[PDB]
Write a protein that binds this ligand. Structure first.
Ligand SMILES: *[C@@H]1O[C@H](CO)[C@@H](O[C@@H]2O[C@H](CO)[C@@H](O)[C@H](O)[C@H]2NC(C)=O)[C@H](O)[C@H]1NC(C)=O
Ligand SMILES: *[C@@H]1O[C@H](CO)[C@@H](O[C@@H]2O[C@H](CO)[C@@H](O)[C@H](O)[C@H]2NC(C)=O)[C@H](O)[C@H]1NC(C)=O
Ligand SMILES: *[C@@H]1O[C@H](CO)[C@@H](O)[C@H](O)[C@H]1NC(C)=O
Ligand SMILES: *[C@@H]1O[C@H](CO)[C@@H](O)[C@H](O)[C@H]1NC(C)=O
Length: 161
């Protein structure tokens, strides 16, 4: 065992949902005030890391039917790799209306949107964006964390690195 055992994803204070892409593998989406990736980097230095990254986000967009509007906006994002299993952390700026509106055309916002509409946990506020069905979602959560993990382990945070 390397370093000390990781905290739980499934907590009384967290909102979480699991997307099962593979036969038992998938993505654990966690909305938290707990930071998992402690650096400011997302180094996709090789084609494999870039490929693992695109597959993770493609999975979320496909499953949630995210039609993300082009607002030329971005979420603060860290990523790391642990033997082929990616971790993606969004430092969400959705705590205030103005902040949410400027980080509205993002995957993280699409996830927040699904959590709200599916009632998966947590309370949110929907701001009418400029276009159709897309809402800018407010949340008090600081982090959205996405980890490639198994169903047996989805309730515990994986090691980022
Ligand atoms: C998201 O916010 C956390 C918290 O501020 C950032 O983690 C910090 O990273 C710096 C390195 O630049 C460390 O010196 C701090 O100790 C970290 N703080 C904590 C609480 O872990 C994280 O880097 C941010 N991620 C992004 C993408 O901005
Ligand atoms: C992500 O990449 C950056 C830059 O590619 C890394 O920062 C480098 O770290 C080395 C330490 O060996 C130092 O020379 C500098 O801090 C950076 N070098 C250059 C050329 O930018 C960073 O450590 C990487 N982090 C992760 C998690 O992969
Ligand atoms: C997360 O932190 C924000 C700001 O500190 C706070 O308002 C919010 O209630 C916290 N949420 C949880 C679930 O701890
Ligand atoms: C998790 O990682 C494995 C290999 O590291 C990959 O085959 C699989 O597609 C990944 N799962 C998701 C949901 O990205």
């Amino acid at each position: 065992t390397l370093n000390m055992t990781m905290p739980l994803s499934c907590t009384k204070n967290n909102s979480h949902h699991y997307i099962m892409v593979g036969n038992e593998t998938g993505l654990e989406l966690t909305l938290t005030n707990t930071s998992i990736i402690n650096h400011k980097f997302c180094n996709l230095s090789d084609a494999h890391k870039k490929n693992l990254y695109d597959h993770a986000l493609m999975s979320i967009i496909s499953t949630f039917h995210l039609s993300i509007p082009n607002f030329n906006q971005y979420e603060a994002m860290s990523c790391d790799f642990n033997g082929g299993k990616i971790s993606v952390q969004y430092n969400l700026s959705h705590s205030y209306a103005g902040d949410a509106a400027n980080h509205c055309g993002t995957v993280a916002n699409g996830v927040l949107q699904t959590f709200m509409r599916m009632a998966w946990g947590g309370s949110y506020i929907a701001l009418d964006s400029g276009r159709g069905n897309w809402d800018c979602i407010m949340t008090s959560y600081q982090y959205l964390i996405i980890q490639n993990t198994t169903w047996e382990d989805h309730c515990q945070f994986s090691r980022p690195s």
